[PDB]
Swiss-Prot record:
Active site: E114
Binding, Zn(2+) 2: H113, H117, H123
Binding positions (Ca(2+) 1): D19, E94
Name assigned to this protein: 22 kDa interstitial collagenase
Glycan attachment positions: N15
Binding site for Ca(2+) 3: D70, G71, G73, N75, D93, E96
Coiled-coil features, chain-numbered ranges: none
Annotated Ca(2+) 2 binding sites: D53, G85, G87, D89
Residues that hold Zn(2+) 1 according to the record: H63, D65, H78, H91
Location of region: Metalloprotease: 1-156
Chain positions of site Not glycosylated: N38
Length: 156
């Protein structure tokens, strides 16, 4: 279980799904980092060039890490645990239809989870928690107490 050693983190969106207008991608990701920074001392700065701590991208099938994606459904996205290089990165399967409504799959809602991982969280057994292994969604995204407790046990 690795932690980031600095509380000020960098992220960059390498590319944009065409499923959603650009501005909506930006706001889904932004608001998702916000869920995590609101309840910890972490801060996040977006950059448009060069390497960031958390590199975010949309990819399909084999994309040169060791977890190829699988077409629509199944695995939706994955993220790496804190650390250098791919450490921290999050990848979204472009074979999904990404949304900004209650319809599958809500980008902001998946991002909230993947970034949990990007910051060092593993899965929760609580079905109401953003970190539950499995996608759940009814149209609102909030950390559950379980999420707050786990991110605070890491960052204070
Ligand atoms: Ca990284
Ligand atoms: Ca998939
Ligand atoms: Ca798509
Ligand atoms: Zn990947
Ligand atoms: Zn997960």
């Amino acid at each position: 279980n690795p932690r980031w050693e600095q509380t000020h983190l960098t992220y960059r969106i390498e590319n944009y799904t065409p499923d959603l207008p650009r501005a909506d991608v930006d706001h889904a990701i932004e608001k998702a980092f916000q869920l995590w920074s609101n309840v910890t001392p972490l801060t996040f700065t977006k950059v448009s060039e060069g390497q960031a701590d958390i590199m975010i991208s949309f990819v399909r099938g084999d994309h040169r890490d060791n977890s190829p994606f699988d077409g629509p459904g199944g695995n939706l996205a994955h993220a790496f645990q804190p650390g250098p290089g791919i450490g921290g990165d999050a990848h979204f399967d472009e074979d999904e239809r990404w949304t900004n409504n209650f319809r599958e799959y809500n980008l902001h809602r998946v991002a909230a989870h993947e970034l949990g991982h990007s910051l060092g969280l593993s899965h929760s057994t609580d079905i109401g928690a953003l970190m539950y292994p499995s996608y759940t969604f009814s149209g609102d995204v909030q950390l559950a107490q379980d999420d707050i407790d786990g991110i605070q046990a890491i960052y204070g």
